[PDB]
Design a protein around this ligand. Structure first.
Ligand SMILES: Nc1ncnc2c1ncn2[C@@H]1O[C@H](CSCC[C@H](N)C(=O)O)[C@@H](O)[C@H]1O
Ligand SMILES: Nc1ncnc2c1ncn2[C@@H]1O[C@H](CSCC[C@H](N)C(=O)O)[C@@H](O)[C@H]1O
Lengths: 6, 264, 266, 7
């Protein structure tokens, strides 16, 4: 779902 | 771990402006809040469901602000008052936060200004910024407001915009020249791209000459880059670019190098 | 049926009486109405649209919500109505088109067959996605005047009452319109009640106000040649068209009163 | 119940 910076 | 570096590897003039940070209270509060948020499995499922269905029609950033999720952290209030070297009650007139995200990073700097100004490409981030009472300006409107900004924050944006070097000289022009200061975060290793809709991306239309084989060298390449746009590093530190986590991981970390730039 | 198309021609400016085109509820308009009535019976999706909009109304603009779902496609004219208004034949074609504030491009698709290159602008992030899906070229709001080119046709379809600088947009159109043969397609919802859409059902008054003084549909159109003359435009042809949109769980289609104008630079 | 997309 990832880090919110790419 | 996130806060240390080989002080020998730095440039001799950077050795004199570095500031040491530590895993303090505010960082723990964020970390402990994030671990609590991930513990709520119902939210994560709802978040990981809405983002999955609309990922094709919006950006990863816009979906986050749409949900108010994935808030990030750079510096704590004390960490910010030690890099800028200001007292807990310090206050000036105007702040400008470029690419402010959802504003949970701007909200740390907000107690020091009567006026906060922000820019954002994402339409839901603009809504999140206006939800914090910030005057959201256009990406080509802030340089022409007719007034200067005492602190222009450009946090983790050069590696995310199309014309970063243009943005630097832009900040130099509208920064209050006598006592204004620029605070600038940057993810190292410097890997720039412009976010697009549907998980896509594009290479920026301006190349920054930030090179290195580790954190200490990429930092050493930045003084000359700031010298181009008319800046000199007054202080800088190493910090984690912390971000709220998903069901898989309680939080996410990226290596940030924050700089306080006085105009030269 | 009829009240969507007729105007009191005696209440019109005697210069507009000459250039008034009478349009009718034609086949292309009923292709839209039947589809909107069809998509209103899709209660499975009609509750899905109603679910997403109720969820994200505070976080996005109503237009951006319609863009994300691809719902609420609107209608102005049919290709026949479009050909009859521009005084062009079906197979007619030219080079450049620019649709200012195109939305999800469902009205641009009516005009798109007549052009080799289609440019368009939008403020909504989801609408721009709906445009790039149609392979249109999305330009910034202040780039289309500064690329250097002139568009053979520029369409401002109901953007005047929804933008902040309407008269500035009129000026910007006159500068970058192909002067020898370029036409301008303008739509405008009357009664003219402008605002600027913001996020969460809020709004803000436009920075500029247009001199649209009129009381019936004909009277508001009477004062429009003055406004277009201020931007260097005269009315070549105009008509009354129903401004339609795809309905919902409670209604099959939503109608507005559009005054559409074909202009040429003077 | 649902607006006319324009408004
Ligand atoms: N050209 C541009 N103008 C203004 N903002 C931009 C931009 N390109 C990217 N951005 C914004 O920059 C952000 C990068 S993520 C950084 C978020 C925030 N500054 C923080 O440090 O926590 C994204 O939210 C994106 O919306
Ligand atoms: N200043 C501006 N520049 C470009 N697009 C704008 C704009 N201001 C508003 N818009 C867009 O223009 C649209 C107006 S509604 C009109 C949409 C379409 N032309 C039609 O006739 O159906 C809105 O969706 C809005 O997103």
């Amino acid at each position: 779902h990832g880090h919110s910076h790419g | 771990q996130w806060y240390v570096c080989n002080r020998e590897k730095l440039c001799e003039s950077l050795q004199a402006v570095f500031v040491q940070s530590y895993l303090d209270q505010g960082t723990q509060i964020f970390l402990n809040n994030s671990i609590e948020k991930s513990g709520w499995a119902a939210i994560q499922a709802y978040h990981s469901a809405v983002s999955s269905a609309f990922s094709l029609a919006m950006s990863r950033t816009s979906i986050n602000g749409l949900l108010g999720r994935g808030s990030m952290f750079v510096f704590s209030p004390d960490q910010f008052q030690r890099l800028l070297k200001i007292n807990p009650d310090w206050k000036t007139h105007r702040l400008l936060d470029l690419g402010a995200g959802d504003g949970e990073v701007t909200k740390i700097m907000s107690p020091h200004f009567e006026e906060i100004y922000a820019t954002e490409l994402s339409e839901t981030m603009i809504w999140q910024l206006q939800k914090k009472k910030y005057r959201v300006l256009g990406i080509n409107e802030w340089q022409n407001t007719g007034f200067q900004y005492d602190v222009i924050s450009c946090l983790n944006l050069l590696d995310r915009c199309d014309q970063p070097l243009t943005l630097l000289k832009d900040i130099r022009s509208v920064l209050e020249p006598t006592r204004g200061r620029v605070i600038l975060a940057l993810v190292l290793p410097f890997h720039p791209y412009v976010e697009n809709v549907g998980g896509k991306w594009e290479k920026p239309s301006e190349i920054l000459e930030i090179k290195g084989q580790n954190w200490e060298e990429q930092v050493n390449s930045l003084p000359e880059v700031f010298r181009k746009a008319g800046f000199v590093i007054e202080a800088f530190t190493r910090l984690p670019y912390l971000c709220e986590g998903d069901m898989y991981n309680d939080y996410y970390v990226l290596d940030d190098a924050v700089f306080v730039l006085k105009p030269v």
